[PDB]
Amino acid sequence: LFDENYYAKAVANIIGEVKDPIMYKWFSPDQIEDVDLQMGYQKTVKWDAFLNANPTTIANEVNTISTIGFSSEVVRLNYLKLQYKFRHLKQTSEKFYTSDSYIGDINNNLLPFAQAYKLASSEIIKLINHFVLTGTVSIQKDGKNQKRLLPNMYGLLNMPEQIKEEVASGDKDKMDKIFEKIEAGLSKLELGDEFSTPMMVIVDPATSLKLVKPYACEKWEDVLIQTIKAINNREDVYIETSNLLKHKILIYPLNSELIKFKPSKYMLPTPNEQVDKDSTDVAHSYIDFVLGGLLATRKTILQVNIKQS
Amino acid sequence: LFDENYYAKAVANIIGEVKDPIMYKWFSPDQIEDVDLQMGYQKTVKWDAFLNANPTTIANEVNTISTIGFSSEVVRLNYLKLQYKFRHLKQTSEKFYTSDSYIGDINNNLLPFAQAYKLASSEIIKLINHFVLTGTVSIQKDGKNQKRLLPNMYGLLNMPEQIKEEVASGDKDKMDKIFEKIEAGLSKLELGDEFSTPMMVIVDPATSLKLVKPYACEKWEDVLIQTIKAINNREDVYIETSNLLKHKILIYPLNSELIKFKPSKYMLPTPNEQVDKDSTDVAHSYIDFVLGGLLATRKTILQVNIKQS
Amino acid sequence: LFDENYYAKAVANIIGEVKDPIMYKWFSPDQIEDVDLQMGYQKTVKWDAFLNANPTTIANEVNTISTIGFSSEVVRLNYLKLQYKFRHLKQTSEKFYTSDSYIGDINNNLLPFAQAYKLASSEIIKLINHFVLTGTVSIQKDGKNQKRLLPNMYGLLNMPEQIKEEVASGDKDKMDKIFEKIEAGLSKLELGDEFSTPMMVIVDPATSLKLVKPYAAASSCEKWEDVLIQTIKAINNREDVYIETSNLLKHKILIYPLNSELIKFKPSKYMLPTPNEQVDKDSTDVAHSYIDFVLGGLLATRKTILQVNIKQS
Amino acid sequence: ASLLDSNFVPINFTEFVQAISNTYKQRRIQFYENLKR
Amino acid sequence: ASLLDSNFVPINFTEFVQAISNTYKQRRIQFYENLKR
Amino acid sequence: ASLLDSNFVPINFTEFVQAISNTYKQRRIQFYENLKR
Amino acid sequence: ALMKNPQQDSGLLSNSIDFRDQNLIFSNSGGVCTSSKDKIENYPAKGYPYKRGVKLSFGDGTTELEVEAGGGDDLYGVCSDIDEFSGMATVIPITNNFTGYLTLKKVNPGDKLNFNQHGELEKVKSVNAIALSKAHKLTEDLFIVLASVFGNR
């Protein structure tokens, strides 16, 4: 294949220069499990067991024994296939644009295939991270003109059947009121028998600025960490800041029994076999990626929204 | 060469005793990359990619796919070649000056070539450190009689298009006002998607003396570190003191994606081949060095100047 | 490749049947040099030296010596890539268009790839020769509807800052007036220190026919051609003079030296027709191919070309 | 089969895509091994 | 590397194009060697 | 070609200069390997 | 200035570190969403018709026809790219639909637009053009808008 497909060869030689997605920092290693599905839906079955009665004492003769039952629950996850197209120079035409210390027309913004693919892959990975965090797909700073998505395709911020708290616009700068809402949400969380787990908190830059203010020589960040440690059996509490968030606070456990990410193994950018060629020096290539796969249990995510208007 | 060139042999045998430049402490290992040049300019091209529209869903048949564009930017860096001359004893005359455990005329301040070269190299390295920190070349404590340099040759302190804050003379001794200016500059910093990076702070001795004061049991230094940690995603904040500065505060990230040092590989002192000889015992030698190569993005350096009058 | 690309194999097997360009007769072997480029510009630097003062006599002890300076000038040449498309029959469909006397569809004007390529290459070479001689690109006999070209792309006939002579309409038949203008132009030529070089003259067929008349009463044993050769030998240090006839010219006479120090042709190494890799294919028996060629690269020193235009209107 | 191996010689585009997927998985595992929160 | 040499076997289209250019240059040299003004 | 390499013997002053540059580069790398903050 | 990608050097790198709203630049050529079956032509350029509706222009006949900015009843297509070295303008014919950023005369999604005398887009009469976004200001005199052109009304 590498004797015939120079584009495949170049992708192989440059694939290692693409940085890892930052979304890996929001999950534990055991929480991510790949699946083999480009487009469509997959059904996940979770089995359970329960005790019907008190156990039976074995003494002398007895035939009537207490029983243990079983239960099943089916969850459907939707996956979507998306594509991008980009232009580049042709392999046979690179030599006529190999300048000093660089290759490509600065005037016409034409690049060799390897560089163009690397840059496009980086941008697509940023888009994938934004989807995984927010659950929406948009390229505008306003977050508008969103691409309509399929049902059963959620992110951490828009997962339904979770704890939602809202801070009024009159209290938008009152860290005490924000913390009161946070404590209410933390009380309404339901971890069951899986409470002993590390916890993850994601905040926006403005909230990050407010967290370092003195608590009203203690900081609001320290108070929040202690409050979460009160409920998570004093496990580790991690705090992360993302510019992808605006006036939002996300709190969720890092336990694979509650929240699990099952992305397609083709989720990250992959070259397409089709290459558009003509009599000129410009060719076009395509990049494929797959979205969807977040699975969560009910009432295990706390989402605090600070209204601004 | 070593059989014929005694001076080259001596330089090779004494090059190791010269101490490392202190400018290496202001940069991360990835930020420094050498270039092959002595004098002139060198254009650097930075390539970027962007998304033009929302991605295209691959379902059924479709020919019209969203595109990814590419953009470029060119930056020019100037370099300057500089030279010094020093007198030393000629090789053949050292025997007539080898005293008890020391060589050279104390009365006439004449030294062997190796010792003279080492001392001159140390002085030149200190001058290079001053240029890198300040962007000016001067040998006076006042900082005047500056040598005129080329455009596109800046240091960390005079880099244009950065966040400049000025503290008025009436507030020269008010740490609260200084910290107010620091907070304003920290807010106006634009790190974008590269905010998760270690940060570096450089202060002057008077500023450090003010920082170790109690915060009007927490110190101003701790408050400043917390404020910077509020924007760099809770990563390391290093504080350094330099006597080269006067009533200045420098804050900038240690990220190679925002600030890059591209010095010439001949920047550090290098002997010149020419040696001035005559019928006496005194010879002259020349040392070459190269200045320039600092590259930064816009609005990524906070420069605070505390006006004293 | 030849086991995979029949079109490449056929081009390799039929390339030798395309005749050489006639522009090779307008230049000396040393005047033509290839450059590696398809589209873009290229600069050439010429270095000169001069004496600042009289030489210094070396006697006894002297430290002050006269100096020699240096200078340079830069010339930029432009190149342009051009392409044509032609239809032909798909290779696998030729068996159904074979005939006892030929291969191809006469009623639809369809040829096999080899023959179509040969004919197209011949036509393109004719166009290239026309550009090299005149410096313009057109497919009309009138010379209108010219393709707009880049600056610094000139031919022998439109090279700027040369010597231009114009013979009036009423004297179009007077060979004596024509020679008067030719002698004036030859006087105005400036070959500098390279004057001892062979010279080349290109004339239109009508002027070529006029040049065989006896020299004028008419003189025996000598013709106007001999008179012209002697006149040019009067300025080229009695060197060789060559005469050529081109139907591309029209009431024009062109005289220039065959010296690489004065006029140099640096064409691209891809100037002559070259097949493109792309071949359009579909469900039918008709395919399309493409041919590329590069124009540009004539460099000349100023006031070394004489252009005589005999006006008819 | 991963793109990391120099011994790996893909036979066709499907094997190339599978190798890309395996390489992404291995880089994810290596990132979590080298991650120190 | 010329089309004149039948021993030459191009591996790809770039080599084929280089061979075409070399063949043109060689034919020009042959023409000037056989030219007699 | 580095002055830290004892076996190295320069032929000319140009090679000596390249050796000095490589020595400075290696010292910078060693400093960053030994630097603790 | 009046160039798609002027050759200008600076002392610092520009602060473009994000993946949102990075395409609102004048150098962004072509269409935002492009088909592999689009027909693309090139013509000699008279003036600077980049990102404007073009029309056929003829001279005295000595040189071949070219294209110049202009719309109305003379509209022949849309200029989507320019090569400055050769002076060649890339044109998409009006018989081929196009989606991309075009120069706007100095507007909300859904509004109908048409090409004026200078080849700029203006609010509405004889051209099928619909604004897909709001106006973006690149310069005191330069405004662009995302529009879809799909023939003659």
Side-chain angles (χ1 to χ4, degrees), chain C residues 96-155:
Chain C
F96 303 120
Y97 296 110
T98 52
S99 168
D100 177 60
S101 305
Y102 57 77
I103 305 186
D105 189 359
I106 296 184
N107 308 300
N108 287 301
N109 305 301
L110 274 161
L111 298 89
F113 175 68
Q115 321 291 358
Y117 182 71
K118 180 197 298 179
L119 293 193
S121 300
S122 300
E123 291 297 300
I124 299 179
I125 294 187
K126 303 179 180 182
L127 186 71
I128 298 175
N129 293 352
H130 182 64
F131 173 65
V132 176
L133 184 73
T134 67
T136 61
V137 179
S138 181
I139 63 173
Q140 297 185 358
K141 188 173 183 178
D142 299 1
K144 299 185 179 183
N145 267 0
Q146 285 181 359
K147 192 182 199 311
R148 191 179 66 181
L149 303 178
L150 298 188
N152 300 61
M153 269 175 80
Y154 303 108

Side-chain angles (χ1 to χ4, degrees), chain B residues 52 65 67 73 76 160 296 298, chain G residues 10 13-15 28 31-32 34:
Chain B
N52 283 299
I65 315 294
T67 61
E73 181 182 1
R76 169 178 172 176
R298 310 179 191 299
Chain G
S10 64
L13 283 177
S14 75
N15 214 353
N28 192 4
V32 291
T34 302

Side-chain angles (χ1 to χ4, degrees), chain G residues 114-128:
Chain G
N114 63 294
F115 285 112
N116 64 0
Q117 314 178 1
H118 309 301
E120 312 170 303
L121 276 177
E122 58 182 1
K123 201 162 180 173
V124 170
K125 48 189 180 185
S126 59
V127 179
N128 276 310

